[PDB]
């Protein structure tokens, strides 16, 4: 009869940057997503595989909550099947996804008048990303032929290039906080329902 | 909202003594707590930022510690200048809030 910590992960101060997204396990509480859907602040609320009005009467097994910060035109890639420099180098969703994707327009918080460049994002990798797999490793990515000693310079670039968030920077480039839940409904008894 | 109990409600110290304060939170806030001192009816000031670091100008006898839910502000070798009232205040979830405070007087 204790209500879930959707209070904690939503109105938090600093969301972690997208190259290292925090994974909050939520279990053994009662959920109420009517305080999530009926609040008209969320610009994007897409649920794949569950209907959004049907979100209440569903006994889950465990509900996770990924959360990060991305720019405006790259919130389209947080969905099963797309590609780009977010969805395969930073955060990859499987193509059997059974959760919901919630967004914002947090231009009020994560945007300084100079550069609020504390939200890093990955840009280069040797391969693509697995479904639901983060990579905090900051390795000097080569691009040509030489192995370059762990030294920056020619053909050896730092992978995490940062963002830049001015308050007058354009709607497709404004910082969008994203929290994406991932449900699960099998191979366990009922834990989360309300 | 996160309530921040502090223990005890008021202390009693002598100069040359070391007493450790405490600001037990309610949730699990990951070192997002700061500590404020405030004397009688004026503007408060900072002592430690993010519960372990230190700001400029202040003495180096204000050492903060602790992480997770329990926090301690260790005052060491306290002079007459550190009479006052002390506050703790989180910064992790919204809305931000200061604490109920411990009043530090002199014997």
């Amino acid at each position: 009869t204790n209500l879930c910590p959707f209070g904690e992960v939503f109105n938090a101060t600093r969301f972690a940057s997208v190259y290292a997204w925090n994974r909050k396990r939520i279990s053994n509480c009662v959920a109420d997503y009517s305080v999530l859907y009926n609040s008209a602040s969320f610009s994007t609320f897409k649920c794949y595989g569950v209907s959004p009005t049907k979100l209440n009467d569903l006994c889950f097994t465990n509900v996770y909550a990924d959360s990060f910060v991305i720019r405006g035109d790259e919130v389209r890639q947080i969905a099963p099947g797309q590609t780009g420099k977010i969805a395969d180098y930073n955060y990859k969703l499987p193509d059997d996804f059974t959760g919901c994707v919630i967004a914002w327009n947090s231009n009020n918080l994560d945007s300084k008048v100079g550069g609020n460049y504390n939200y890093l994002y990955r840009l280069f990798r040797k391969s693509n990303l697995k479904p639901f797999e983060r990579d905090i490793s900051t390795e000097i990515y080569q691009a040509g032929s030489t192995p370059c000693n762990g030294v920056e310079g020619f053909n050896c670039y730092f992978p995490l290039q940062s963002y830049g968030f001015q308050p007058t920077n354009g709607v497709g480039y404004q910082p969008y906080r994203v929290v994406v839940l991932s449900f699960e409904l099998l191979h366990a008894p009922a834990t989360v329902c309300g | 909202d996160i309530v921040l109990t502090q223990s005890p409600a008021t202390l009693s110290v002598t100069p040359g003594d070391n007493v450790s304060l405490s600001c037990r939170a309610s949730q699990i806030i990951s070192n997002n707590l700061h500590w404020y001192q405030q004397k009688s009816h004026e503007s408060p000031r900072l002592l430690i930022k993010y519960a372990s670091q230190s700001i400029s100008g202040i003495p180096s006898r204000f050492s903060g510690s602790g992480s997770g839910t329990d926090f301690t502000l260790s005052i060491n070798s306290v002079e007459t200048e550190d009479f006052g009232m002390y506050f703790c205040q989180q910064s992790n979830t919204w809305p931000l809030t200061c604490g109920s405070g411990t009043k530090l007087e002199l014997n």
Partner: nanobody, 119 residues
Framework: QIQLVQSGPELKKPGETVKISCKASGYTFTDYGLNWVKQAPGKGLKWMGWINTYSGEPTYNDEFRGRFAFSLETSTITAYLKINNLKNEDTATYFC????????????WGAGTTVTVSS
């Protein structure tokens, strides 16, 4: 010189509107926010709410949801705090404090304006 100086103590009647000031200079005003703090006599501090110092968009502690408004004049650097429908509840000192747009610890404070209400 980084300091936040304010206006004087106010004496109003229940049913009036007051407007207290908070004017800052010495730093670049757009690099940080502004957090207003209400201190009752003998209690802790309650963060009233933060206002962004670039667009004038307020955000309230939802305990203080109505009757309060954080104005902002940008050229003449000032954040106002308007209080509608003054009651016997609302007597307290009212600071203003500069807590950043990324950190949120109130380092630079102000002298505080004691607003007192009685008939």
């Amino acid at each position: 010189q980084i300091q936040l100086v304010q206006s004087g103590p106010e004496l109003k009647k229940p049913g009036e509107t007051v407007k207290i000031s908070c004017k800052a200079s010495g730093y670049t005003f757009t690099d940080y926010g502004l957090n207003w703090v209400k201190q009752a006599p003998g209690k802790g501090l309650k963060w009233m709410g933060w206002i962004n110092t670039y667009s004038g968009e307020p955000t309230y502690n939802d305990e203080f949801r109505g009757r309060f408004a954080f104005s902002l004049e940008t050229s003449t650097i000032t954040a106002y705090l308007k209080i509608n429908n003054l009651k016997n509840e609302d007597t307290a000192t009212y600071f203003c404090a500069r807590g950043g747009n990324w950190d949120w610890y109130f380092d630079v404070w102000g002298a505080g304006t004691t607003v007192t209400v009685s008939s």
